[PDB]
């Protein structure tokens, strides 16, 4: 913009999981990008370049981090998939906020489910917070702005 916005003020909301204020707060969000797979072809007589063709649109997994929370609803949902193969996809909204705490821009993440859950190593000789990490697979996203 004339002065572009910073990246440290944002909100993560879930649809299909009971809401709690402690499940909307995260330390970091990553994975909001996309790419197109292509193929190459050489045409006889054309020596200046090879041709390139698109094939598929590709998205990476969405990664969320925060300090450990013991009564999380999101984690209970993750456990049902992890332990029993019960899968029930959800939708999600990522919001980048302005100074009035209203959205500048949002991302609509469609049909997501859990593929990973972990907690970082313990160390008796270091002063650190216990950090939790969750990774989700989804089909695509759209933006609103």
């Amino acid at each position: 913009t004339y002065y572009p916005p910073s990246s440290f003020h944002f909100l993560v909301e879930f649809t299909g999981i009971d809401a709690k204020n402690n499940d909307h707060e995260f330390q970091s969000v990553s994975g909001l990008s996309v790419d197109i797979d292509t193929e190459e072809f050489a045409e006889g007589g054309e020596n200046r370049f090879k041709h390139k063709f698109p094939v598929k649109t590709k998205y990476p997994n969405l990664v969320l981090k925060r300090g450990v929370l013991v009564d999380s609803k999101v984690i209970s949902w993750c456990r049902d998939a992890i332990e029993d193969f019960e899968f029930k996809p959800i939708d999600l909204t990522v919001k980048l906020l302005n100074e009035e705490h209203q959205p500048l821009m949002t991302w609509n993440v469609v049909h997501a489910y859990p593929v990973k859950w972990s907690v970082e190593d313990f160390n008796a000789q270091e002063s650190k917070m216990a950090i939790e990490s969750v990774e989700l697979s989804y089909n695509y996203f759209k933006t609103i702005v």
């Binding site: 006889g44 007589g45 054309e46 020596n47």
Partner: protein, 56 residues
């Protein structure tokens, strides 16, 4: 007759493959690769002189 250095071989062609690789924009070829197989020929009067067959 095929000659290169120490090599000297007489015979006939059996097999050939030619593959065309690069072209000018109007379709003129400028690069190609060829694979070849040659058999061996001996005339029958020379075979009995090389097999100097000798109780007879």
């Amino acid at each position: 007759m095929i000659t290169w250095g120490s090599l000297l071989f007489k015979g006939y062609l059996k097999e050939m493959d030619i593959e065309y690789k690069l072209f000018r924009p109007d379709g003129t070829p400028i690069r190609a690769m060829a694979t070849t197989k040659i058999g061996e020929f001996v005339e029958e009067e020379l075979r009995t002189a090389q097999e100097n067959n000798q109780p007879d």
